[PDB]
Amino acid sequence: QGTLYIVSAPSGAGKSSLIQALLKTQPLYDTQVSVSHTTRQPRPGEVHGEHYFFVNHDEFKEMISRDAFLEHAEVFGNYYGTSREAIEQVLATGVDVFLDIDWQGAQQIRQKMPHARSIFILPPSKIELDRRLRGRGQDSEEVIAKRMAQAVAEMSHYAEYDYLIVNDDFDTALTDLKTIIRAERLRMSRQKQRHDALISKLLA
Amino acid sequence: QGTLYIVSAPSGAGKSSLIQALLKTQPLYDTQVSVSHTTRQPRPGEVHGEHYFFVNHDEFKEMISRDAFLEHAEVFGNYYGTSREAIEQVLATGVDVFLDIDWQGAQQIRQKMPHARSIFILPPSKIELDRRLRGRGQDSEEVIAKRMAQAVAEMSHYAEYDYLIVNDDFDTALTDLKTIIRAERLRMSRQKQRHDALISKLLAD
């Protein structure tokens, strides 16, 4: 019923913000963000099943052994992963899910979910990507150069995705994202289900 | 480069006006309607290459022999069809082409143009379809029942299409159409070509 949207981009393409901006304007019965499993400890305020599903390292490795993840990775001595079951339960409710992930996990997901759509977001020029990576302007030139090399390595994978948004002006990019989602919702397999009663009435 | 959009709908779904409104706000280097070939005789105002590509029965038949049409029909002594050459020429210049056609012509085109996208447009309810078919309201219940039967026959094929727009509010339907065309242009196949130079500068150094 719902569509899984894999969203990736180098730092500096405004990806995280674009997704957050999307959730602020769509009801949870239409659009939700993926909730990942993690082995890190819950922090104050976090809720299991809401900010993350919190498991311990053995549970996570056990899950991995039963191939329970669409993707997982170890990051700073903690594992993070996207549970297949969790994603399917939400999609089965007709909700579209946005799964922000690097190109590696995006490749893992696509292998298990051929129907997942994926969107890559790019910065609009080398100069603007460099400006956005510099943020407040407080990092050393070498740290920035490593951020740029990392962004370039991420962007080299752009052709593996189904859609490309060049985020120059934020609101233009965000309209682009909403356009993708709206168009996918005008597709016949979703529309004939959504308008099932109406079509039956029109043809009777 | 460009995409062929097959657009169909029963009368009463605002299809022609939606397409027309589309052409009013997009440049010819982005969007055009297809120009059909026909043996009918040019009429007042019609210009070859614009309202139709006018040709005579022998040319049309020779084209049919060459399977040069994506679809064609023969009605009241005349041929009407969409030249495959004329469409691919425009598509090859990166332009999206809209082809307004009935469901039968739509099936003919799809088989020959698997990459074409089709959009079907529906009225928003039986009562509103009936209201729109009655128009100014100067027709017999017989003519209306016939319009409605014809609309029903057209709608029974809606599932053969890639997209469905339910045209309740006109402006909202027009935005739907524009959304489809913009989303298609965001696909990787077209974006990677459109931004080739940008992408190459981003990866450089």
UniProtKB/Swiss-Prot annotation, chain B:
Reaction(s) catalysed (UniProt annotation): GMP + ATP = GDP + ADP
Subcellular location field: Cytoplasm
The keyword RNA-binding is annotated on this UniProt entry: no
Keyword line: ATP-binding, Cytoplasm, Kinase, Nucleotide-binding, Transferase
PROSITE patterns the record matches: GUANYLATE_KINASE_1 (PS00856), GUANYLATE_KINASE_2 (PS50052)
Gene Ontology annotations for the cellular component aspect, listed alphabetically: cytosol
Domain Guanylate kinase-like positions: 2-182
InterPro entries hit by this protein: GK/Ca_channel_bsu, Guanylate_kin-like_dom, Guanylate_kinase, Guanylate_kinase_CS, P-loop_NTPase
Top-level taxon in the UniProt lineage: Bacteria
One Pfam family cited in the UniProt record for this chain: Guanylate_kin
Top-level class of the enzyme under EC nomenclature: transferase
Residues that bind ATP: 9-16
SMART domains assigned: GuKc (SM00072)
Gene3D superfamilies: Guanylate Kinase phosphate binding domain, P-loop containing nucleotide triphosphate hydrolases
One GO MF term: guanylate kinase activity
UniProt-listed Enzyme Commission number(s): 2.7.4.8
Family: Belongs to the guanylate kinase family.
Function: Essential for recycling GMP and indirectly, cGMP.
Matches recorded under HAMAP family: Guanylate_kinase
PANTHER family: GUANYLATE KINASE, GUANYLATE KINASE-RELATED
Subunit structure: Homotetramer (under low ionic conditions) or homodimer (under high ionic conditions).
Name assigned to this protein: Guanylate kinase
Lineage per the UniProt record: Bacteria, Pseudomonadati, Pseudomonadota, Gammaproteobacteria, Enterobacterales
